[PDB]
Write a protein that binds this ligand. Structure first.
Ligand SMILES: O=C(O)C[C@H](NC(=O)OCc1ccccc1)C(=O)O
Ligand SMILES: [Ca+2]
Ligand SMILES: [Ca+2]
Ligand SMILES: [Ca+2]
Ligand SMILES: [Ca+2]
Ligand SMILES: [Zn+2]
Length: 316
């Protein structure tokens, strides 16, 4: 809508206070005009019809518990935009500042979030498995990264290409979590998963097997569930990414870490220059080695660490 840019205040899912960019026109709307063609947040009103109605508020204060998931979806989309812009010189998910849209309060007791090809969508969770999913910055960033992937490599959501697609979203979700410096870790979804249980998460990048995901290519899932295990075999790549950044010894193979910033640069280049819709794990390795070579030279420590990491998880 057309109106005046202003700034409101609210409380997120975890009870933290934050400022959010809104637009004034009779009502205050969750519309951020400061980033690209805008960030727009919608109320799906417990239904499944999308996008719902652009979020309207009477006083520019968002402290109702109903408001919380909207606050976080709106705010964290903003942070994710900033990350891609400031760190990788990318303007929104399409590279041309496309408007970013999210709907919250999707369905009832819905334990999921997704990119539907056009926008992000967040359930409120059932209160046991999940609380509202936009409360996790690694969740929001994971979802927006699916959009980035769809506009660049276009990795098919199936088998090995799909697992790469998933890992890319976990990797960048995590890098965005570190960027915002919000209790960063190498775990996925910890802030919104099982509110009754401390210290757990949905997935782990540092140790995927902790939650039954493979940390080695020999342990990959070869069945048909989960589109050929896209959320399972991603563990293999997640572990490789963890090793490149942090270093360590895995199945007897030692890796010197090169840190988060270089990890991000290598994988962003691979994603945007070398991966294709049908890339498999072995092609990912090649893309990553070539990217590091491009950036740091073929005899660099960087190239060496990328090679050691993929060796450690058994990807040749
Ligand atoms: O399969 C899909 O496309 C939807 C799936 N969504 C999903 O797993 O929602 C929960 C969640 C998301 C990110 C991080 C932690 C938890 C996905 O995005 O991978
Ligand atoms: Ca209000
Ligand atoms: Ca965290
Ligand atoms: Ca995390
Ligand atoms: Ca928990
Ligand atoms: Zn995903």
């Amino acid at each position: 809508i057309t109106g005046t840019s202003t700034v409101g205040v609210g409380r997120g899912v975890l009870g933290d206070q934050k400022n959010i960019n809104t637009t004034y026109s009779t009502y205050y709307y969750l519309q951020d005009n400061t980033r690209g063609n805008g960030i727009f947040t919608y109320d799906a009103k417990y239904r499944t019809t999308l996008p719902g109605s652009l979020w309207a508020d009477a006083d520019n204060q968002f402290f109702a518990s109903y408001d919380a998931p909207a606050v976080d979806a709106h705010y964290y989309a903003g942070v994710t935009y900033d990350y891609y812009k400031n760190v990788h010189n990318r303007l929104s998910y399409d590279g041309n500042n496309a408007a970013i849209r999210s709907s919250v309060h999707y369905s009832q007791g819905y334990n999921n979030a997704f990119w539907n090809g056009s926008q992000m969508v967040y359930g409120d969770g059932d209160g046991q498995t999940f609380i509202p999913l936009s409360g996790g910055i690694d969740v929001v960033a994971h979802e927006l990264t699916h959009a980035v992937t769809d506009y660049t490599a276009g990795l098919i959501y199936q088998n090995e290409s799909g697992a790469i697609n998933e890992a890319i979203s976990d990797i960048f979700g995590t890098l965005v979590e570190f960027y915002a410096n919000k209790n960063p870790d190498w775990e996925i979804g910890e802030d919104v998963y099982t509110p009754g249980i401390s210290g757990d998460s949905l997935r782990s990048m540092s140790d995927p097997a902790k939650y039954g995901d493979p940390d080695h290519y020999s342990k990959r899932y070869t069945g048909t569930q989960d589109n050929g295990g896209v959320h399972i075999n991603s563990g293999i790549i997640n572990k490789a990414a963890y090793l490149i950044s942090q270093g360590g010894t895995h199945y007897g193979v030692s890796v010197v870490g090169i840190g988060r910033d270089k990890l991000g640069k290598i994988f962003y280049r691979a994603l945007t220059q070398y991966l294709t819709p049908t890339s498999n794990f072995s092609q990912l390795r090649a893309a990553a080695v070539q990217s590091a070579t491009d950036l740091y030279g073929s005899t660099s420590q960087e190239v060496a660490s990328v090679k050691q990491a993929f060796d450690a998880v058994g990807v040749k």
